[PDB]
Amino acid sequence: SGFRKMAFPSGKVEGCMVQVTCGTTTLNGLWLDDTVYCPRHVICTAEDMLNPNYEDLLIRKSNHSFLVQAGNVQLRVIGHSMQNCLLRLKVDTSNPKTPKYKFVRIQPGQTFSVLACYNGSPSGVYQCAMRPNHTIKGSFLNGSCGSVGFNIDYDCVSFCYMHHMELPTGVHAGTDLEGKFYGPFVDRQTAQAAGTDTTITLNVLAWLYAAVINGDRWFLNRFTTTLNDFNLVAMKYNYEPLTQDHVDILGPLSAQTGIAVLDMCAALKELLQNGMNGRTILGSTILEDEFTPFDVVRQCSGVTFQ
Amino acid sequence: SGFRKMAFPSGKVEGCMVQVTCGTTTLNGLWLDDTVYCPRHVICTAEDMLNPNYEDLLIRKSNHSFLVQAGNVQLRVIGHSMQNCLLRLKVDTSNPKTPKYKFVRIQPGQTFSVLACYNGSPSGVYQCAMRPNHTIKGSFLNGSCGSVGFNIDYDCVSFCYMHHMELPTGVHAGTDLEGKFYGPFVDRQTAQAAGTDTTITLNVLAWLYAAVINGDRWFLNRFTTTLNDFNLVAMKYNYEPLTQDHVDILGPLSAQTGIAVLDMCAALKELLQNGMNGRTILGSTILEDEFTPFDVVRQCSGVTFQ
Ligand SMILES: *[C@@H](C(=O)N(CCC(N)=O)NC(=O)[C@H](Cc1ccccc1)NC(=O)[C@H](CC(C)C)NC(=O)OCc1ccccc1)[C@H](O)C(=O)OCC
Ligand SMILES: *[C@@H](C(=O)N(CCC(N)=O)NC(=O)[C@H](Cc1ccccc1)NC(=O)[C@H](CC(C)C)NC(=O)OCc1ccccc1)[C@H](O)C(=O)OCC
């Protein structure tokens, strides 16, 4: 019993973290096989963070311009290239600790674990969701660029995020492991802002199923709704529209709890309209939107507490 | 910027997790040097979970009654003993991956990371606090007994919890790594209940400092309070009393933000008395009590966003 945001155990990714230094800049990198990946802004200098031209900043770099440090050991750089907003440095050595891994591009509303690192040294791990506005609400201080986000299935690490920037509202922006940003952001210190965000409807509904699977039914009601009517109320509250795909995704949870998805929507549409005020759901006031239906299945019992 | 519950990276503890089987029971253990530690209830049988006599259940066990499995490898058991509510099994082998470690007995209000494991296989990590009523609000399903809680400073793992039981309210109970329970609980399936819990005042105040360090001042006020007057209001709301020790602990945060602790108490005493209703603090409605002043210092910037 219990329901907690939880991260994947971080050990397979700790054995991949290194420190990359170019000049007086040090930031984190990710060593997998014989390659180190890191934000290309490692090559910026203090005086040009506004409009760096990376292609031009890089052609002035050689292999011995980069030092890669793994533990107390120095990795020799034997080639480099840029890929989108990342650099790929070839090192002497293949990392004995490389796990099975994939690189994947996570989709808004999905969740992943962040391993926050400074100077190549892991300091903490936490779960977060890719927001609909393509930023994440992370927790990162100076030196965290290069920290990665990932998910793990069986023995395989699916890397999905490398950290790059913080935006004025204190939320965070970064790229996939091919160096393509999430969202419209760019790796320069020019004014950028997160676009308005929206609540992730699919996740809020999932988390209502988890509350029920765990034993709470208080927020239910005897009413049903049309997808279309629900979506009218969602607009008003700044929720993403619910699509039939989202409804189908929620099938297994609906089946385990015996509550039809559109009955759960009417319950949400009543929480939205009438408030919670006085009562929590799984320890929370505020409808929580950072758990996927997959995260609820992974973590809850397969047997409903009826 | 940002503020997130975060766990310590879990890799050093993943390399310590094994599976211990006695009969048809399998649960997790913790291998450190040449010893495996696990809940003694691994020796219970289906028909006596109410009143097992462990001393008598154990004298009927030999070394070859236990199988210890590390990865695909079998560890031979070469001696065993009981210690309080744990067994210590000596294995053939010293674990090559033992980190520097200590065993410590965490104190109520402190926080630690739990690595949830099933069958010796880590599945997730999350942060939780030792509640004043000596249970933790964890998230654990059948097979999680033996999962551990820990903190890490530098290279050293301080183990503080091994999981044993779930109580009817869905909260959790367990022991230190010397096998002494936290709280008045016992390792048998006889009726037990968590005592009434209380909110952890020191942590709520810490988290008000973190909100300020991050840049929010909304809940402040022009008023001050007496420790004693604050405590009157704390009783009414079911908060632990605030002691001068707690006040001294909060000094560094007070100094970084320039808000006197007793001014922060008056602000809390006004949140308590007037509600939050409409506004959040670091993303939360509900005053959060699962971050220590040490966890806020570890995670926030050292420079206040004034
Ligand atoms: C890199 C690092 O630690 N971080 C993470 C910061 C954090 N708290 O998450 N990354 C950076 O600091 C960015 C460095 C940079 C990136 C591209 C090009 C040049 C430099 N910069 C920022 O994240 C910056 C804010 C910092 C807190 C100052 N963000 C923006 O400028 O966003 C755009 C913007 C919006 C509004 C007004 C102005 C700008 C680590 O710092 C490092 O090694 O840096 C080397 C460059
Ligand atoms: C051990 C295991 O996975 N867990 C963790 C359970 C969880 N979800 O956290 N531990 C147990 O299940 C306990 C097993 C046990 C302990 C001592 C002696 C004999 C057996 N039992 C419980 O935790 C049990 C509840 C279970 C969900 C059934 N708790 C209590 O009975 O609490 C006291 C009580 C209160 C009110 C009424 C009755 C009892 C894993 O299950 C294993 O290997 O078990 C081997 C014994």
XYZ file of C-alpha atoms and ligand atoms in Angstrom:
704
model
C 0.000 0.000 0.000
C 1.151 3.638 -0.301
C 1.806 5.757 -3.326
C 4.976 7.753 -3.753
C 6.718 9.443 -6.716
C 9.521 7.166 -7.335
C 12.532 7.155 -9.478
C 14.265 4.175 -11.114
C 17.261 2.956 -9.263
C 20.079 5.087 -10.564
C 23.128 2.824 -10.415
C 23.306 1.844 -14.053
C 23.416 5.611 -14.971
C 25.889 6.534 -12.161
C 28.499 4.282 -13.791
C 28.077 6.433 -16.939
C 28.724 9.853 -15.499
C 31.832 11.799 -16.182
C 33.156 15.334 -16.118
C 34.068 17.174 -19.341
C 36.242 20.315 -19.180
C 36.902 22.740 -22.107
C 38.912 25.711 -20.920
C 37.598 26.916 -17.594
C 34.160 25.248 -18.171
C 33.362 21.924 -16.458
C 30.023 20.140 -16.874
C 28.731 16.628 -16.820
C 28.881 14.070 -19.504
C 27.610 10.537 -20.216
C 30.022 7.840 -21.258
C 28.543 4.839 -23.068
C 30.814 2.474 -24.851
C 33.665 4.572 -26.226
C 31.779 7.898 -26.567
C 31.110 10.820 -24.185
C 27.966 12.965 -24.803
C 27.613 16.494 -23.355
C 25.996 19.862 -23.960
C 27.883 21.739 -26.732
C 27.777 24.846 -24.560
C 30.830 23.406 -22.853
C 32.702 25.311 -25.616
C 31.217 28.772 -24.927
C 33.221 31.459 -23.233
C 32.241 33.970 -20.631
C 32.130 36.847 -23.102
C 29.918 35.196 -25.733
C 26.928 33.429 -24.253
C 24.422 35.516 -26.160
C 25.137 34.422 -29.784
C 27.728 31.706 -29.808
C 28.300 30.235 -33.276
C 29.097 26.677 -32.350
C 30.229 25.513 -35.745
C 32.785 28.319 -35.620
C 33.594 27.849 -31.933
C 34.219 24.123 -32.609
C 36.488 24.329 -35.679
C 38.882 26.239 -33.317
C 38.819 23.185 -30.905
C 41.064 20.073 -31.094
C 40.816 16.608 -29.417
C 43.272 17.740 -26.670
C 41.100 20.829 -26.052
C 38.669 18.516 -24.071
C 39.564 16.667 -20.862
C 37.293 13.839 -19.804
C 37.568 12.641 -16.227
C 36.062 9.365 -14.981
C 36.577 8.990 -11.273
C 40.226 9.734 -10.666
C 41.020 8.565 -14.212
C 41.599 10.684 -17.294
C 40.118 9.493 -20.547
C 41.999 10.479 -23.650
C 39.850 12.178 -26.316
C 40.525 10.686 -29.739
C 37.880 12.415 -31.918
C 34.918 14.807 -31.624
C 31.929 15.911 -33.547
C 28.879 17.923 -32.904
C 25.357 16.581 -33.148
C 22.627 19.116 -32.937
C 23.109 20.660 -29.441
C 25.434 17.927 -28.093
C 29.096 17.023 -28.593
C 30.153 13.377 -29.088
C 33.757 12.887 -27.937
C 35.451 9.591 -28.759
C 37.577 8.446 -25.833
C 40.474 5.852 -25.610
C 38.403 3.586 -23.591
C 35.132 1.768 -23.723
C 33.275 2.185 -20.387
C 33.346 -1.274 -18.709
C 30.114 -0.231 -16.944
C 27.974 0.648 -20.012
C 24.560 -0.911 -19.497
C 22.195 -2.044 -22.276
C 20.788 1.315 -23.336
C 18.723 3.030 -25.966
C 18.186 6.688 -26.715
C 14.469 7.623 -26.990
C 12.544 10.905 -27.349
C 9.993 11.027 -24.540
C 6.580 12.611 -25.366
C 4.874 15.285 -23.357
C 3.018 13.881 -20.287
C 5.532 11.041 -19.947
C 7.684 10.746 -16.832
C 11.363 9.954 -16.252
C 13.989 9.944 -13.558
C 16.631 12.641 -13.386
C 19.937 12.011 -11.948
C 21.259 15.388 -10.849
C 25.093 15.562 -11.175
C 27.723 18.223 -10.485
C 31.252 17.938 -11.789
C 30.498 14.466 -13.018
C 29.385 13.405 -9.520
C 25.827 12.206 -9.006
C 24.157 14.045 -6.136
C 20.443 13.077 -6.220
C 17.645 11.421 -8.187
C 14.027 12.491 -8.652
C 11.077 11.827 -10.898
C 9.559 14.478 -13.158
C 7.198 14.653 -16.168
C 7.846 16.204 -19.587
C 5.371 19.085 -19.379
C 3.022 19.877 -22.256
C 5.047 23.150 -22.784
C 8.168 21.013 -23.166
C 10.012 22.062 -20.056
C 10.323 20.073 -16.815
C 9.968 21.280 -13.302
C 13.343 20.060 -12.129
C 15.586 21.016 -9.330
C 19.062 22.051 -10.664
C 21.783 24.543 -9.650
C 24.858 25.808 -11.606
C 26.999 22.869 -12.856
C 24.061 20.583 -13.523
C 24.154 20.916 -17.307
C 24.801 17.466 -18.779
C 22.738 15.674 -16.016
C 20.503 13.063 -17.628
C 16.924 11.773 -17.412
C 16.097 8.165 -18.162
C 13.644 5.242 -17.667
C 14.631 1.599 -17.213
C 12.817 -1.488 -18.463
C 14.364 -4.808 -17.485
C 18.089 -4.378 -17.821
C 17.791 -1.558 -20.411
C 18.301 2.139 -19.797
C 16.343 4.363 -22.135
C 17.964 7.749 -21.995
C 15.584 10.549 -22.798
C 16.933 13.930 -21.523
C 20.138 15.850 -21.076
C 19.907 19.049 -19.104
C 20.924 22.399 -20.695
C 19.093 25.517 -19.486
C 16.995 27.116 -16.753
C 14.274 29.589 -17.741
C 13.227 32.568 -15.738
C 10.248 30.918 -14.019
C 12.732 28.415 -12.544
C 11.723 25.545 -14.862
C 14.134 23.621 -17.067
C 14.916 22.846 -20.714
C 17.098 20.383 -22.428
C 17.414 17.861 -25.217
C 17.207 14.195 -26.188
C 20.397 12.233 -26.552
C 20.553 13.142 -30.205
C 20.827 16.826 -29.036
C 17.456 18.027 -30.348
C 15.795 20.270 -27.836
C 12.419 19.548 -26.371
C 10.209 22.572 -27.148
C 11.175 25.740 -29.103
C 14.193 26.537 -26.964
C 17.810 27.168 -28.084
C 21.149 26.824 -26.287
C 22.022 30.522 -25.921
C 21.427 33.124 -23.204
C 19.018 35.133 -25.177
C 15.545 35.900 -23.814
C 13.332 32.787 -23.987
C 10.265 31.922 -21.871
C 8.313 28.694 -21.265
C 4.941 28.912 -23.135
C 1.832 28.565 -21.029
C 1.527 25.063 -19.633
C -1.524 22.908 -19.227
C -2.466 20.170 -16.838
C -1.987 16.639 -17.989
C -5.527 15.179 -17.948
C -4.460 11.553 -18.676
C -2.263 11.559 -15.553
C -4.715 13.141 -13.281
C -7.273 10.367 -14.218
C -4.566 7.678 -13.725
C -3.846 8.939 -10.296
C -7.622 8.738 -9.459
C -7.509 5.137 -10.449
C -4.450 4.549 -8.218
C -6.270 6.193 -5.318
C -9.210 3.782 -5.873
C -6.899 0.708 -6.323
C -5.334 1.626 -2.974
C -8.771 1.727 -1.406
C -10.238 5.247 -1.575
C -13.611 5.838 -3.390
C -14.655 9.178 -1.829
C -14.586 11.419 -4.983
C -16.728 9.043 -7.097
C -20.222 9.899 -8.181
C -23.320 8.347 -9.761
C -22.902 10.392 -12.923
C -21.435 9.747 -16.371
C -20.168 12.138 -19.111
C -19.617 12.543 -22.845
C -16.027 12.923 -23.895
C -17.111 16.097 -25.578
C -18.821 17.578 -22.533
C -15.846 16.714 -20.423
C -13.555 18.533 -22.776
C -15.653 21.681 -22.570
C -15.021 21.743 -18.792
C -11.359 20.852 -19.338
C -10.767 23.971 -21.480
C -12.230 26.143 -18.728
C -9.764 24.687 -16.200
C -6.758 24.512 -18.412
C -6.562 20.756 -18.816
C -5.442 19.044 -22.009
C -8.253 17.632 -24.016
C -9.003 13.989 -23.445
C -8.935 11.913 -26.611
C -10.183 8.375 -27.235
C -6.567 7.238 -27.216
C -6.170 8.521 -23.658
C -9.427 6.721 -22.784
C -8.114 3.422 -24.288
C -4.816 3.802 -22.453
C -6.821 3.873 -19.188
C -8.624 0.580 -19.979
C -6.583 -1.776 -17.739
C -6.999 0.528 -14.722
C -10.697 0.886 -15.480
C -10.964 -2.907 -15.650
C -9.071 -3.545 -12.417
C -11.313 -1.038 -10.576
C -14.559 -1.554 -12.499
C -15.146 2.250 -12.926
C -15.724 3.354 -16.547
C -13.330 5.964 -17.790
C -16.149 8.424 -18.604
C -17.504 7.888 -15.071
C -14.054 8.749 -13.758
C -14.219 11.928 -15.990
C -17.463 12.939 -14.506
C -15.875 12.497 -11.080
C -12.923 14.689 -12.225
C -15.309 17.172 -13.809
C -16.985 17.411 -10.289
C -13.656 17.811 -8.485
C -12.825 20.590 -10.879
C -16.236 22.162 -10.470
C -16.784 21.628 -6.730
C -13.254 21.610 -5.351
C -11.712 19.104 -2.942
C -11.399 21.478 0.000
C -11.206 19.488 3.218
C -10.150 16.218 1.683
C -7.054 14.713 0.145
C -6.555 11.987 -2.390
C -3.503 9.799 -1.778
C -2.157 12.439 0.671
C -2.684 15.283 -1.816
C -4.995 18.293 -2.189
C -4.357 19.499 -5.744
C -4.989 17.020 -8.499
C -1.615 15.466 -9.228
C -0.527 15.122 -12.917
C 2.943 13.762 -12.706
C 2.079 9.947 -12.707
C 1.405 7.997 -15.934
C -1.095 5.184 -16.180
C 2.078 3.032 -16.751
C 3.657 4.422 -13.543
C 0.489 3.582 -11.647
C 0.375 -0.002 -13.001
C 4.193 -0.445 -12.196
C 3.704 0.701 -8.658
C 0.219 -0.392 -7.534
C -0.897 -3.829 -6.523
C -2.512 -5.881 -9.319
C -5.323 -6.706 -6.872
C -7.803 -3.907 -6.060
C -8.628 -3.279 -2.355
C -12.365 -3.522 -2.969
C 16.058 26.786 -8.993
C 13.256 24.289 -8.243
C 12.619 22.157 -5.223
C 11.908 18.462 -5.465
C 11.946 15.542 -2.986
C 15.003 13.772 -3.960
C 16.635 10.575 -3.080
C 20.364 9.782 -2.930
C 21.667 8.031 -5.950
C 21.041 4.386 -5.245
C 23.887 2.577 -6.997
C 26.087 1.914 -4.006
C 23.085 0.144 -2.301
C 21.994 -1.732 -5.487
C 25.326 -3.586 -5.473
C 24.392 -4.800 -1.957
C 21.028 -6.343 -2.658
C 20.434 -10.025 -2.659
C 17.646 -12.549 -2.324
C 17.401 -14.850 0.717
C 15.176 -17.956 0.570
C 14.233 -20.186 3.574
C 11.753 -22.831 2.515
C 9.133 -21.319 0.259
C 9.826 -17.755 1.583
C 11.955 -15.350 -0.493
C 12.724 -11.791 0.622
C 15.459 -9.276 0.176
C 18.722 -9.075 1.932
C 21.751 -6.757 2.166
C 25.216 -8.120 1.609
C 28.096 -6.087 3.038
C 31.485 -7.631 3.282
C 30.923 -11.311 4.035
C 27.534 -10.993 5.810
C 23.903 -10.945 4.597
C 21.299 -9.119 6.778
C 17.547 -9.812 6.447
C 14.291 -9.813 8.378
C 14.137 -12.888 10.678
C 10.578 -13.463 9.503
C 12.145 -15.214 6.539
C 11.959 -18.284 8.844
C 8.204 -18.126 9.580
C 5.797 -20.534 7.995
C 2.365 -19.997 6.594
C 0.637 -21.603 9.565
C 2.390 -19.636 12.321
C 2.579 -15.934 11.603
C 0.664 -14.967 14.712
C 3.116 -16.061 17.475
C 6.294 -17.330 15.929
C 8.986 -18.113 18.510
C 12.060 -17.229 16.531
C 14.615 -18.612 18.923
C 12.812 -21.939 18.593
C 12.171 -21.585 14.860
C 15.908 -20.872 14.350
C 17.457 -23.716 16.382
C 15.621 -26.011 13.868
C 17.477 -24.196 10.969
C 20.965 -25.044 9.598
C 23.391 -23.083 7.329
C 22.130 -25.041 4.257
C 18.534 -24.145 5.208
C 19.195 -20.610 3.709
C 19.977 -19.919 0.043
C 21.467 -16.552 -0.803
C 21.359 -15.469 -4.425
C 23.404 -12.566 -5.817
C 22.587 -11.982 -9.443
C 22.768 -15.371 -11.092
C 25.282 -16.488 -8.446
C 24.643 -18.565 -5.348
C 26.416 -17.576 -2.174
C 27.170 -20.382 0.213
C 25.970 -19.767 3.789
C 28.694 -20.624 6.288
C 27.153 -19.461 9.605
C 24.062 -17.672 10.958
C 22.889 -15.900 14.013
C 19.989 -13.802 14.988
C 20.250 -10.208 16.119
C 17.128 -8.700 17.499
C 14.667 -8.876 14.541
C 17.302 -9.570 11.845
C 19.341 -12.605 10.794
C 23.069 -12.263 9.988
C 24.144 -15.006 7.564
C 27.857 -15.446 6.915
C 28.467 -16.190 3.245
C 31.537 -17.719 1.400
C 32.248 -14.513 -0.250
C 32.968 -10.932 0.576
C 30.889 -8.630 -1.690
C 33.402 -6.956 -4.070
C 30.919 -4.051 -4.280
C 30.593 -3.227 -0.542
C 30.813 0.538 -0.189
C 32.112 2.407 2.881
C 29.085 2.112 5.146
C 27.882 2.654 8.665
C 24.731 1.544 10.417
C 22.919 4.428 12.196
C 19.565 4.793 13.991
C 17.733 7.699 12.374
C 15.625 9.929 14.701
C 12.044 10.906 14.130
C 11.681 13.843 11.664
C 14.819 12.779 9.786
C 14.612 11.730 6.142
C 16.178 8.899 4.136
C 16.003 7.216 0.776
C 14.305 3.868 0.346
C 15.318 1.513 -2.266
C 12.307 -0.697 -2.906
C 13.376 -4.258 -3.913
C 11.525 -7.457 -4.814
C 13.258 -10.807 -4.942
C 16.562 -9.097 -4.407
C 15.959 -6.850 -7.438
C 15.817 -3.095 -6.945
C 12.690 -1.620 -8.510
C 12.507 2.040 -7.367
C 13.861 4.693 -5.007
C 12.025 7.391 -3.059
C 12.551 9.730 -0.153
C 10.542 9.515 3.065
C 10.758 10.821 6.659
C 10.764 8.819 9.900
C 7.409 9.965 11.278
C 7.033 11.056 14.895
C 4.888 7.866 15.456
C 7.829 5.815 14.190
C 6.338 4.522 10.983
C 7.063 5.795 7.461
C 4.653 6.499 4.700
C 6.305 4.245 2.160
C 5.121 2.558 -0.927
C 5.672 -1.259 -0.688
C 3.885 -4.395 -1.956
C 4.334 -8.095 -0.959
C 8.009 -9.174 -1.291
C 9.429 -5.839 -0.211
C 10.486 -6.967 3.260
C 14.262 -6.572 3.530
C 14.292 -3.376 1.320
C 16.536 -0.772 2.928
C 16.574 2.964 3.675
C 19.812 4.908 3.770
C 21.532 8.337 3.475
C 24.904 8.969 1.835
C 27.566 11.470 2.854
C 30.628 11.606 0.623
C 31.440 8.041 -0.275
C 29.750 6.594 2.855
C 26.390 4.867 3.016
C 24.663 5.189 6.357
C 22.066 2.477 6.483
C 19.166 3.324 8.722
C 16.097 1.131 7.914
C 15.158 -2.353 6.851
C 11.550 -2.902 5.923
C 9.419 -5.482 7.817
C 5.688 -4.757 8.121
C 2.698 -2.842 6.772
C 0.054 -1.609 9.218
C -3.604 -1.338 8.496
C -3.599 2.367 7.585
C -1.169 1.475 4.773
C 1.909 2.917 6.529
C 5.094 0.975 7.212
C 7.289 -0.307 10.049
C 10.715 -1.717 10.238
C 14.031 -1.705 12.040
C 17.577 -0.345 12.102
C 20.375 -2.520 10.838
C 20.892 -3.893 14.307
C 17.279 -5.271 14.046
C 15.694 -3.049 16.706
C 12.335 -1.824 15.560
C 11.488 1.816 15.243
C 8.428 2.433 17.454
C 6.571 -0.120 19.652
C 5.984 -2.597 16.851
C 6.862 -6.332 16.749
C 7.503 -8.738 13.868
C 4.334 -10.850 14.127
C 0.892 -10.663 12.508
C -0.903 -9.768 15.624
C -3.069 -6.640 15.795
C -0.876 -3.513 15.974
C -1.735 0.064 14.926
C 0.363 3.192 14.280
C -0.151 5.658 17.206
C -1.480 9.071 16.308
C 1.061 11.027 14.304
C 1.956 14.673 14.484
C 3.284 17.143 11.990
C 6.971 17.797 12.008
C 7.232 21.521 12.858
C 11.026 21.790 12.264
C 10.562 20.587 8.670
C 7.647 22.712 7.858
C 9.705 25.831 8.931
C 12.711 24.574 6.884
C 10.594 24.279 3.835
C 9.386 27.921 4.353
C 12.973 28.967 4.338
C 13.600 27.009 1.104
C 10.593 28.700 -0.483
C 12.084 32.111 0.466
C 15.648 31.126 -0.682
C 14.109 30.191 -4.039
C 12.475 33.593 -4.227
C 8.974 33.505 -2.707
C 8.108 35.841 0.261
C 4.284 35.864 0.024
C 3.414 34.177 3.395
C 5.652 36.487 5.484
C 4.258 39.008 7.897
C 5.299 41.981 10.036
C 4.707 40.056 13.245
C 6.915 38.163 15.694
C 6.113 35.450 18.308
C 7.221 33.899 21.591
C 8.290 30.301 21.374
C 5.738 29.638 24.046
C 2.857 31.329 22.249
C 3.747 29.522 19.088
C 3.616 26.212 20.854
C 0.132 26.919 22.166
C -1.065 27.248 18.541
C 0.980 24.196 17.536
C -0.876 21.951 20.021
C -4.198 23.085 18.570
C -3.075 22.061 15.066
C -1.273 18.915 15.971
C 2.270 20.087 15.358
C 5.239 18.975 17.439
C 6.386 21.535 19.898
C 9.215 23.744 18.761
C 12.193 23.715 21.100
C 15.202 26.037 21.244
C 17.255 23.258 19.684
C 14.979 23.272 16.637
C 15.334 27.077 16.552
C 19.179 26.813 16.653
C 19.151 24.174 13.929
C 17.363 26.723 11.695
C 20.052 29.404 12.246
C 21.955 29.035 8.933
C 18.725 29.251 6.907
C 17.602 32.223 8.977
C 20.963 33.878 8.305
C 20.944 33.221 4.562
C 17.418 34.699 4.290
C 17.612 37.323 7.043
C 14.204 36.279 8.556
C 14.323 35.492 12.303
C 13.127 32.055 13.219
C 10.406 33.422 15.540
C 9.252 35.690 12.689
C 9.024 32.605 10.501
C 6.927 30.989 13.348
C 4.568 33.848 13.388
C 4.219 33.434 9.624
C 3.522 29.683 10.156
C 1.176 30.470 13.027
C -0.756 32.724 10.489
C -0.782 30.042 7.786
C -2.177 27.652 10.334
C -4.708 30.185 11.540
C -5.703 31.784 8.220
C -5.148 28.981 5.730
C -3.314 29.155 2.403
C -6.370 28.676 0.207
C -5.670 30.049 -3.254
C -1.915 29.995 -3.027
C 0.861 27.443 -3.086
C 4.322 27.434 -1.629
C 6.941 25.705 -3.782
C 4.119 24.084 -5.830
C 2.306 22.857 -2.707
C -0.913 23.667 -0.830
C -0.556 21.774 2.454
C 2.435 22.623 4.568
C 5.051 20.039 3.668
C 6.966 18.308 6.540
C 9.107 15.792 4.804
C 12.255 18.029 4.183
C 14.929 18.598 6.866
C 16.797 21.848 7.284
C 19.833 19.711 6.166
C 17.926 18.547 3.047
C 17.093 22.151 2.239
C 20.727 23.303 2.636
C 21.945 20.268 0.462
C 19.542 21.120 -2.290
C 19.113 24.916 -2.349
C 21.496 27.478 -3.705
C 23.837 29.028 -1.107
C 22.900 32.442 -2.534
C 19.405 33.771 -1.721
C 17.308 35.162 -4.631
C 16.658 38.435 -2.824
C 25.485 24.865 -17.248
C 24.378 24.722 -16.200
O 24.638 24.389 -15.025
N 23.142 25.117 -16.533
C 22.013 24.672 -15.720
C 21.461 25.887 -15.013
C 20.368 25.441 -14.093
N 20.230 25.979 -12.880
O 19.661 24.534 -14.508
N 22.937 25.811 -17.812
C 23.130 27.125 -17.895
O 23.372 27.746 -16.888
C 23.063 27.850 -19.224
C 24.482 28.073 -19.736
C 24.498 28.402 -21.218
C 23.730 27.680 -22.132
C 23.845 27.988 -23.505
C 24.736 28.982 -23.950
C 25.540 29.650 -23.062
C 25.433 29.362 -21.698
N 22.427 29.152 -19.045
C 21.261 29.207 -18.474
O 20.720 28.136 -18.161
C 20.616 30.550 -18.322
C 20.244 30.925 -16.897
C 21.360 30.731 -15.886
C 20.732 30.458 -14.507
C 22.127 32.057 -15.827
N 19.350 30.482 -19.077
C 18.936 31.379 -19.987
O 19.613 32.374 -20.292
O 17.611 31.166 -20.551
C 17.296 32.157 -21.536
C 16.996 33.540 -20.973
C 15.702 33.858 -20.549
C 15.431 35.151 -20.065
C 16.449 36.116 -20.022
C 17.753 35.792 -20.447
C 18.034 34.498 -20.908
C 26.723 25.447 -16.555
O 26.277 26.743 -16.155
C 27.861 25.682 -17.549
O 28.845 24.957 -17.688
O 27.765 26.846 -18.383
C 28.755 26.837 -19.430
C 28.110 27.790 -20.428
C 7.333 -9.657 3.697
C 6.773 -8.362 3.102
O 6.733 -8.182 1.868
N 6.180 -7.495 3.933
C 5.965 -6.121 3.485
C 4.475 -5.925 3.334
C 4.233 -4.557 2.777
N 3.289 -4.347 1.858
O 4.983 -3.679 3.180
N 5.951 -7.889 5.330
C 4.865 -8.586 5.655
O 4.030 -8.796 4.810
C 4.667 -9.128 7.057
C 5.058 -10.601 7.076
C 5.289 -11.101 8.491
C 6.031 -10.360 9.412
C 6.272 -10.914 10.689
C 5.800 -12.197 11.020
C 5.126 -12.956 10.096
C 4.873 -12.419 8.830
N 3.261 -9.018 7.433
C 2.673 -7.863 7.339
O 3.362 -6.893 6.985
C 1.237 -7.768 7.753
C 0.296 -7.236 6.685
C 0.437 -7.910 5.332
C 0.015 -6.912 4.239
C -0.542 -9.089 5.331
N 1.197 -6.797 8.864
C 0.597 -6.993 10.049
O 0.013 -8.053 10.329
O 0.601 -5.868 10.972
C -0.028 -6.208 12.213
C -1.543 -6.336 12.144
C -2.350 -5.203 12.292
C -3.749 -5.342 12.262
C -4.329 -6.610 12.100
C -3.514 -7.749 11.949
C -2.119 -7.614 11.954
C 6.930 -10.816 2.776
O 5.507 -10.820 2.885
C 7.398 -12.161 3.334
O 8.378 -12.792 2.939
O 6.627 -12.725 4.404
C 7.288 -13.857 5.001
C 6.603 -13.891 6.361
